[PDB]
Design a binder for this molecule. Structure first.
Ligand SMILES: [Zn+2]
Ligand SMILES: [Zn+2]
Lengths: 259, 259
């Protein structure tokens, strides 16, 4: 009965009908205006501890594809930065475009990237993800821009398995993936309080959005575009433009860890 | 696997473990201290429109039994009183004791009744119940005390079907029930902002609690106590004392429609 998507009739412009928080005061994504996003010197260094990250599976959920991690222990955690205590990595996914010029959720001085990576973490204060998503400080999503340029070696293992999860509901074993291979060199970041960028759009996310994009090749991102929103047997609907546009900032302050 | 109940180990004293809102600022039930619950002359008469009410079924959910109504239209609505706009009746149920001296959720100057009836309504503003339960003004529950006295004729149709829904999961067709037959003659009420009295304890409820109890016979309430929490084939666990005790009022005001 309930569906949502990125199409003409079920798209971001309509999500409010089932999810009234879509018009809330803390919605993501947003545009980062660098002229207004002020350097905050009290922001601490971001601590990314992914050395023991344990990936398990990869799956097409009908909106994006997710790589899932074992979050039963502190094997892959985000700490410091703007955060209070310890946030475990549960999954990552991407949003991308039908063309190289668009695909990202966050924009920077109105500039769109080809795609955006989201590493999703939950506050261990709340015992599990389910309890976390319902708290204002429940999640931390580390957001990373993807520009088209040189191939990203650390992304190839993802790209290579995509032909096995073409359609909604498909999944595959996906062990030993190294998420450090998707990070840029600089951990300089912007931060602001926001939300999930898909329904149910819960306002439980501390956003950390990195200054430095990673590069991916034209052919790498092109592989993302050969996925399907639809299930097996249904009409083909290519999985492209699965991004929500910039939402009004309202009275939120985007703080910068760098000058 | 998540469970809750009224037992030693899964009871109201433990609900906070899975539902941290249990310790929130707007939890129900409460004690109504009549010395402090002040008459508010600006409170309007309560408007109960149940003339077209359409009951459908009755069911044992493993925590109480519910009589469900067709809420697809304005056939049975609560309006006026402390409420803004129109609230449709979805179901009623009761909480009761193992003895005649206890069973109610709300108390009045610490006085417990043998049971408490809850007519559950949702704000039509939000399209359905599912969306309603997540809003601060989503629900209105009309609460009515039951004291042991004379038989309530309008309750007998409920009592007579209970042998057919003994155990969790059991349901039966239940048409043409008249919910007006469960009302006392006075619609004088106390009101306060609160919550669901069972998990998930959401703080979405405008409580309207009637001053005048209805009477039920000793044998009528005794029939409620022959129901089972458990499913068919499971150990017998009599459905008694399915009430949450009074929670701290915090900085809430209980207003009275009467002097
Ligand atoms: Zn995302
Ligand atoms: Zn109830």
């Amino acid at each position: 009965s309930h569906h949502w998507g990125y199409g003409k009739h079920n798209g971001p412009e309509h999500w409010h009908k089932d999810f009234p928080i879509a018009k809330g005061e803390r919605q993501s994504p947003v545009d980062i205006d660098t002229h207004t996003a002020k350097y905050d010197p009290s922001l601490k260094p971001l601590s990314v501890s992914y050395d023991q990250a344990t990936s398990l599976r990869i799956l097409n959920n009908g909106h994006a594809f997710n790589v899932e991690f074992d979050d039963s222990q502190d094997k892959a955690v985000l700490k410091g930065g703007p955060l209070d205590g310890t946030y475990r990595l549960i999954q990552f996914h991407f949003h991308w475009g039908s063309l190289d010029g668009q695909g990202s959720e966050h924009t920077v001085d109105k500039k769109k990237y080809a795609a955006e990576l989201h590493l999703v973490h939950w506050n261990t204060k709340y015992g599990d993800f389910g309890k976390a998503v319902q708290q204002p400080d429940g999640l931390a999503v580390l957001g990373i821009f993807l520009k088209v340029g040189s191939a990203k070696p650390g992304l190839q293992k993802v790209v290579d398995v995509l032909d096995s999860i073409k359609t909604k509901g498909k999944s595959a074993d996906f062990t030993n993936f190294d998420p450090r291979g998707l990070l840029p060199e600089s951990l300089d970041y912007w931060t602001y309080p926001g939300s999930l960028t898909t329904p149910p759009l819960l306002e439980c996310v501390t956003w950390i959005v990195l200054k430095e994009p990673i590069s991916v090749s034209s052919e790498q991102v092109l592989k993302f575009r050969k996925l399907n929103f639809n299930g097996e047997g249904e009409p083909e609907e290519l999985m492209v433009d699965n991004w929500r546009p910039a939402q009004p900032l309202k009275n939120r302050q985007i703080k910068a860890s760098f000058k």
